[PDB]
Amino acid sequence: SGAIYVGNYRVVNRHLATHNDWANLVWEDSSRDLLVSSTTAQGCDTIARCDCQTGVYYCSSRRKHYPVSFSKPSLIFVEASEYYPARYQSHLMLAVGHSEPGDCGGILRCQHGVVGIVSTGGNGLVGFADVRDLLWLDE
Numbered sequence: 800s801g802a803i804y805v806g807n808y809r810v811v812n813r814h815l816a817t818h819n820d821w822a823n824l825v826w827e828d829s830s831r832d833l834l835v836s837s838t839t840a841q842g843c844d845t846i847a848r849c850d851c852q853t854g855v856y857y858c859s860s861r862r863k864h865y866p867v868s869f870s871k872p873s874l875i876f877v878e879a880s881e882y883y884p885a886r887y888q889s890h891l892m893l894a895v896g897h898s899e900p901g902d903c904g905g906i907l908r909c910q911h912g913v914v915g916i917v918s919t920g921g922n923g924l925v926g927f928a929d930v931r932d933l934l935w936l937d938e
């Protein structure tokens with residue numbers, strides 16, 4: 800689990816969104832595994848605006864942060880899980896690293912701020928849903 804809090808937005812994995820997230824829906828993209836809901840409290844996270852390919856992600860199944868190199872956001876074929884059939888996830892970034900389903904929502908960060916959130920994994924790879932392109936998160 801985990802979310803990003805910026806302005807009056809909460810960014811979560813679409814597959815982990817709650818009933819309140821869907822009741823306060825701002826934007827969702829199934830192909831990206833992202834959902835943004837509205838919040839009453841002001842968020843204070845900074846979204847990275849950059850094309851860094853290095854950063855640090857929180858891994859709840861290790862209680863550790865790991866520095867990684869990751870690919871630029873792209874359309875990557877993702878195997879079926881309990882949440883989606885097999886399909887292309889868009890705006891996905893891969894790194895070599897440990898990931899388990901419950902690690903979804905872990906934040907990937909660079910020097911500029913939040914890059915994205917843990918969304919996918921398998922065979923020693925961790926996939927992160929990019930948020931850096933969502934410029935509207937910042938007004």
Ligand SMILES: COC(=O)c1ccncc1N
Pocket residue numbers: 880898899900901902903918919920921922
């Ligand atoms: C998104 O979680 C998964 O489906 C997953 C499966 C297997 N290994 C890592 C994972 N993250």
Ligand SMILES: COC(=O)c1ccncc1N
Pocket residue numbers: 857864908
């Ligand atoms: C989980 O802690 C972090 O890595 C972090 C949180 C908030 N701002 C910057 C950070 N590096």
Ligand SMILES: [Zn+2]
Pocket residue numbers: 847848849850851909910911912
């Ligand atoms: Zn950056």
